[PDB]
Amino acid sequence: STGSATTTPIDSLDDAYITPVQIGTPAQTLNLDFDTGSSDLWVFSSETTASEVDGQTIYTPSKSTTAKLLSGATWSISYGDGSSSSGDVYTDTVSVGGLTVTGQAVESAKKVSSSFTEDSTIDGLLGLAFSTLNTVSPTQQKTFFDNAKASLDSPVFTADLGYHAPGTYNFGFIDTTAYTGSITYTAVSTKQGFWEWTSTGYAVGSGTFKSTSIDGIADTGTTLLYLPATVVSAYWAQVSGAKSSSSVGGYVFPCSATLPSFTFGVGSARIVIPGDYIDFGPISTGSSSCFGGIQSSAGIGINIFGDVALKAAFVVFNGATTPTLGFASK
Ligand SMILES: Cn1c(=O)c2c(ncn2C)n(C)c1=O
């Protein structure tokens, strides 16, 4: 089997991407944030505290003839951005882009933190990291991909995120028309439950490539590119007037600037992030200070190849017995 679904930016900055997901019978379609940095499929629901729902589409398990309470199971998750959610669990039929999993754990939110409430466009998350990170207790649950894997034509999914445009998540096949050149594969460590890999270096603009190992995670659920402070400083030093602002919470730059590209290494291959991908616009409406798309990972504890990096590539998440990651230009 295979599946193919379009993923769409939630706003003009590509802050996140939403992908329609069919849950239950008859189908309830919710727009979920596919997150390769976590492993819970959770949704706004009929159980979510009413004051914490503001425009989201909810899953109502009592209206699904295939929903079953997973008795005694609870979940609770906190994300790198400080947001969180928790609740109980149903199993139900879940389909993405024509690919159907029966008995998928659908984690129903009883509580969500303010950032979720305030984002009316995201109806929940669909985790695509390794199932060892799933938070369901006392019986850990499998991700949608892990449940689908054996049925797939090939045990893979791909992320093809757009810049200010829709893109695609495919399951079970590699669309050879969706990228240019060849795909370069690189080793993954699953020791922390992430799609963790080691970039071979970077360049800033037309500058020379610096060979250096940068361990990080491929994370579709993180907006920006978070790298060591040394690398980030080298990038922003090439933008007149750029500076790190503790009050704003990272590097800002004059909105009048033209940003240089940023290149990252994948083995001997190179992925180029155009400068425009690094512009996240005014820090507040009407401001001439703009927020940067490359930020320091110091204090996070891990480097994160988020959407800014991933949307410059066609990315293969290879879930074979020994997982690997593939990157191609497009
Ligand atoms: C602080 N900040 C962000 O954290 C941010 C942003 N755009 C995207 N992000 C993530 N802007 C404009 C911003 O000012």
Residue 166: other Cβ atoms inside 10 A: 13
Q: Is 35 a catalytic residue?
A: yes
Rounded distance between C-alpha atoms, residue 86 and residue 42, angstroms: 9
Whether 90 contacts 104, CB under 8 Å: no
Give the bridge partners for 201, in sequence order: 211
Burial of 191 (0-12, 13-18, 19+ CB in 10 A): exposed
- Is 199 known to be catalytic? yes
Q: Tokens 């800002």 belong to which residue?
A: 252
In one-letter notation, the amino acid at residue 3 is G
Q: Are 242 and 251 in contact (CB under 8 A)?
A: yes
Q: Which residues pair with 272 in a beta bridge?
A: 263
**What is the number of H-type helices and E-type strands within the chain?**
4, 24
Token code pair at residue 235: 């990038």
287 C-beta closer than 6 A to ligand 1: no
Mutate to test the pocket of ligand 1, among 291, 294, 304, 311 (most ligand atoms within 8 A of CB): 291
Residue 29 CA to residue 13 CA, distance in Å, equals 24
| Neighbouring-strand partners of residue 254 | 289
DSSP summary character for residue 21: E
Q: Ligand 1 centroid to 6 CA: how many Å?
A: 25
Tokens of 284: 């507040």
Nearest 5°: CA angle at 126, between 91 and 296? Answer: 150
Q: Which of 74, 109, 68 is nearest to 90 (CA)?
A: 68
Contacts 24+ apart (CB under 8 A), 233-241: 234/204, 234/210, 235/204, 235/260, 235/262, 235/294, 236/292, 236/294, 238/204, 238/205, 238/207
Question: How many residues are there in the chain?
Answer: 330
> Which domains are seen in the chain, by residue range?
5-174 (2.40.70.10), 175-330 (2.40.70.10)
Q: Resolution limit in angstroms? A: 1.3
CA separation for the pair 228, 239 (Å, rounded): 18
Rounded CA-CA distance 213/317 in Å is 20
239 and 261 Cβ atoms separated by less than 8 Å: no
Q: Tell how strand 17-23 and strand 3-9 pair up.
A: antiparallel
Choice from 115, 255, 283 to test ligand 1 binding pocket (greatest atom count within 8 A of CB): 283
Q: Is 283 in the pocket of ligand 1 (CB under 6 A)?
A: yes
Tokens for 158, please give them: 């791909």
CA of 267 to the centre of ligand 1 (A): 31
Between CA 90 and CA 312 the distance in angstroms is 36
CB 196 within 8 A of CB 129: no
Question: Containing H/E element for 273?
Answer: strand 269-273
Q: Note whether 281 and 248 are within 8 A (CB).
A: no
The method of structure determination was X-ray
Interatomic CA distance for residues 244 and 82, integer angstroms: 21
Local structure of residue 239 (DSSP, 8 states): S
Residues 6+ away with beta carbon under 8 Å from 309: 225, 264, 271, 273
- In contact, 49 and 111? CB cutoff 8 Å: yes
**What is the rounded (10 degree) CA torsion for 209, 213, 215, 216?**
0
CA of 293 to the centre of ligand 1 (A): 8
